Design a protein around this ligand. Sequence first.
Ligand SMILES: Cc1cc2nc3c(=O)[nH]c(=O)nc-3n(C[C@H](O)[C@H](O)[C@H](O)COP(=O)(O)OP(=O)(O)OC[C@H]3O[C@@H](n4cnc5c(N)ncnc54)[C@H](O)[C@@H]3O)c2cc1C
Ligand SMILES: [Cl-]
Ligand SMILES: [Cl-]
Length: 485
Amino acid sequence: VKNSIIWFRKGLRLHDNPALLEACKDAKHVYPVFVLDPHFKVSVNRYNFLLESLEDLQRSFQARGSRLLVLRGKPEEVFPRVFREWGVTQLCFEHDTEPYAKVRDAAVRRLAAEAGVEVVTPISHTLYDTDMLVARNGGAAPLTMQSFTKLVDRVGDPPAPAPDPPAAMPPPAEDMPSAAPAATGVPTWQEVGFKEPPLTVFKGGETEALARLEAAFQDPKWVAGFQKPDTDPSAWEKPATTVLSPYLKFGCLSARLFHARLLEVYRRHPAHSQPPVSLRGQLLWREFFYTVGSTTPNFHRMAGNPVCKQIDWDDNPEFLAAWREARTGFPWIDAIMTQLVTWGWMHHLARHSVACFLTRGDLYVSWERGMEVFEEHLIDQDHYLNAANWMWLSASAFFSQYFRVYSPVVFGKKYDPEGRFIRKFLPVLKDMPAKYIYEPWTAPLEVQRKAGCVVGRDYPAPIVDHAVASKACIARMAAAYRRSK
Ligand SMILES: Cc1cc2nc3c(=O)[nH]c(=O)nc-3n(C[C@H](O)[C@H](O)[C@H](O)COP(=O)(O)OP(=O)(O)OC[C@H]3O[C@@H](n4cnc5c(N)ncnc54)[C@H](O)[C@@H]3O)c2cc1C
Ligand SMILES: [Cl-]
Ligand SMILES: [Cl-]
């Protein structure tokens, strides 16, 4: 008989899950598995988001006669056991192009073959088979968004979302010891070792992802006319973009479903925005960075990375600490960095502000250091997207216009002159008059005292003078660029 495992890593969804559909086909028993390495820096925000995503999967599987098995251990150690215990003949999982995934998945494939297990690994985390895209482009990934968009337009539409799985699923076999409920339940953030609770406002799981998708498409005119660079990074009550990145990162939402819904709207709105600024463009940025990242060695590092300029970043731990701890003395910067740690998500241009500040803009700290801080706190932390955008923002790859430097004072003021965003994430400045809220060190001491926010006592003074720092950084950047002629 056919006993299959559908192994969840990303692709934490029932919809558009060809791995799942295959595992269920003609199956007597299906074991939906997630492998939790229990000795696993990572914020509780992201880890709890994953846990909530597993809980959602548990509910969906229980609604269909099955249940999610959260196995504790390393895959190489767990799968050999359950292959034989469950008499498994087929192992299915969504393909993953991350470096670790290639190593892990190769090891699992070898073990599967030893046990006579058929391995099926469809593509469904990305819009396209990214290796096919590289092959269609003559064997090398495009290195600009312009050429990437021309490639995908020549390739055509991505595959349609896979059908929904059956309303009843073949369950796991009863009395299998490795499937005992007490050993295979979804843990809470407390049980895995976290002491502080999650603070983010975005709940994980496919069910939330689909609801947020529908909310975004409630206004097709907004979807059609979406222009990413025109959106407001200070909007926090109702974020100006979809906030689907956490759900796309974990696969709670299919990118192909997202794309297909976009085309349905675009068909009815002929003036809809186009790439790169359109909502479809945003999925293409993701596809672009996955394609280049997956084919580039050491993509997440500077040294040994062929696409990354070698820059003489300062090893300045005090500057890094100040930025990381939201005490730069620039409320716009510190507010965004507070949003990072509390929500684990910020608007793209808020990420621009803090990343430019840390790297080529002001502090001249390496983008690898900023990426590590983002990697800890972002609930949408994505290996390729985080690396690519950090290289972009530091002018190390893809982007080279290092004379464009965001002001940590003026940038946010264009959107939010009252500083409502600052007042939300930095309550110490709640009473500061708007005239000074972006530059509190310029307020008269009487204003500071009346506002209950004395610079140097309640809120730090700026760690740099932007005018002086940005001029020095641009000088260093120009030098670094001449070095790599
Ligand atoms: C320094 C820095 C770090 C970043 N780190 C991450 C990260 O770890 N994970 C992540 O998903 N994005 C990352 N981004 C990209 C971007 O900031 C987020 O994808 C976006 O802010 C998420 O909001 P949204 O879902 O509302 O995006 P929308 O505008 O609604 O876009 C829809 C989707 O398109 C994709 N997308 C959008 N913008 C980009 C982009 N610039 N690059 C790649 N894909 C994009 C995401 O999957 C996103 O959910 C980073 C950007 C910068 C500058
Ligand atoms: Cl854009
Ligand atoms: Cl600016």
